[PDB]
Design a protein around this ligand. Structure first.
Ligand SMILES: Cc1cn([C@H]2C[C@H](O)[C@@H](COP(=O)(O)NP(=O)(O)CP(=O)(O)O)O2)c(=O)[nH]c1=O
Ligand SMILES: [Cl-]
Ligand SMILES: [Cl-]
Ligand SMILES: [Cl-]
Ligand SMILES: [Mg+2]
Ligand code: NA
Ligand code: NA
Ligand code: NA
Length: 326
DNA sequence: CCGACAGCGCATCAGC
DNA sequence: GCTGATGCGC
DNA sequence: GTCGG
């Protein structure tokens, strides 16, 4: 974090563009710049120096010069002082409240935690749970707790059907010392790209995690993706652990490598890798890598028997999960 | 200059 | 009910 | 906002 001040500034600009301006490409431009600077191994001395990095252009270069000179950005100073922008930015920190809902709430004069609490009837189910655990969801998860949660999830999944394979992905699989949530990839031999030979495969696992009181709440749930809330059990007389977000994704078993590549991330790594794929004439999703024909239509799935196979196709040297934290 | 920017699951709604 | 668009999420 | 062509 040689360049913490700068990458914080760009992230704040990103968040403004996403939540207030609703300019998603500006958001991603700022995040890409923050990312490339984050792993740049020198303490940056100028905007011109930063502008050599890909993703950093003239505008960001000038902002870095202002920041280096003064320790601040006037544009951000103003944004921080704007009530509508500060309110909208805040409301989006509730899970299930995005830029559109946030602006709409602020329109009706709902713009604080208190306002949300008194207007619970105006929230959909996801938003109500996001509000319920607002404090908890901004806390990080020590890797030691991630390991206990892993133990529980893998053991409970085993009790349902010993042929399930649960893999913890996200920042955990990239070796992070703390995670923002838990991400779990699930496979079962009955569910492949060819067939689903058994219904309720995700439901059964969710139901078991609920019954042992690990999963406490549900934000959303379909046939292949669960989004909800979990909690470690605490000992006698101990303060309870915070509630945690948990994502579970059931992936066709024969497509495990594309699925684990996707769910390991980072999100910016995935965007960079999939963009590069396109430049190489392929498209990557969580299921397949496919060639692009001249028209731009995707062809048939290419054989994949490892994460590295996917890197090979697009002519990237293999990068271990721990080196994917972009 | 300017088109493209990763790719997809689930919830909610409008239009039929 | 379905289909397609949009919001929010991974 | 940035970049490739
Ligand atoms: C948010 C997001 C996630 N993903 C993938 C990659 C990510 O690593 C995986 C888990 O999502 P996450 O939101 O839990 N991200 P994380 O890398 O686990 C970081 P954190 O959860 O520890 O804060 O889902 C994407 O491909 N695109 C995305 O926009
Ligand atoms: Cl934009
Ligand atoms: Cl600032
Ligand atoms: Cl596919
Ligand atoms: Mg995560
Ligand atoms: Na650059
Ligand atoms: Na939110
Ligand atoms: Na997650």
């Amino acid at each position: 974090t040689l360049n913490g001040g700068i990458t914080d500034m760009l992230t704040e600009l990103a968040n403004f563009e996403k939540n207030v301006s609703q300019a998603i490409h500006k958001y991603n431009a700022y995040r890409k710049a923050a990312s490339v600077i984050a792993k740049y191994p020198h303490k940056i001395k100028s905007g011109a120096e930063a502008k050599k990095l890909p993703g950093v252009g003239t505008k960001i270069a000038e902002k870095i010069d202002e920041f280096l000179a003064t320790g601040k950005l006037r544009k951000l100073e103003k944004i921080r002082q704007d009530d509508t922008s500060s309110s909208i930015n805040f409301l989006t920190r509730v899970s299930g409240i995005g830029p559109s809902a946030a602006r709409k709430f602020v329109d009706e004069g709902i713009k604080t935690l208190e306002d949300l609490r008194k207007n619970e009837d105006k929230l959909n189910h996801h938003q109500r749970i996001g509000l319920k655990y607002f404090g908890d969801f901004e806390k990080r998860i020590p890797r030691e707790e991630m390991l206990q949660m892993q133990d529980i999830v893998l053991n409970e999944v085993k009790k349902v059907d010993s042929e399930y394979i649960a893999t913890v992905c996200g920042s955990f699989r990239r070796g992070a010392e703390s995670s923002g949530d838990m991400d779990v990839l699930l496979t079962h031999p009955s569910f492949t790209s060819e067939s689903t030979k058994q219904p309720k495969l995700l439901h059964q696992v969710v139901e078991q995690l609920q019954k042992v009181h690990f999963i406490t709440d549900t934000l959303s749930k379909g046939e292949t993706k669960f989004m909800g809330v979990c909690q470690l059990p605490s000992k006698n007389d101990e303060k309870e652990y915070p509630h945690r977000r948990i994502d579970i994704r059931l992936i066709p078993k024969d497509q495990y490598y594309c699925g684990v590549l996707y769910f390991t991330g980072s999100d910016i790594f995935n965007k960079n890798m999939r963009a590069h794929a396109l430049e190489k004439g392929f498209t990557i999703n969580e299921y397949t890598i496919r060639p692009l024909g001249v028209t731009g239509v995707a062809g048939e799935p290419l054989p994949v028997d490892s994460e590295k196979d996917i890197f090979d196709y697009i002519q990237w040297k293999y990068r271990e999960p721990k080196d994917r934290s972009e």
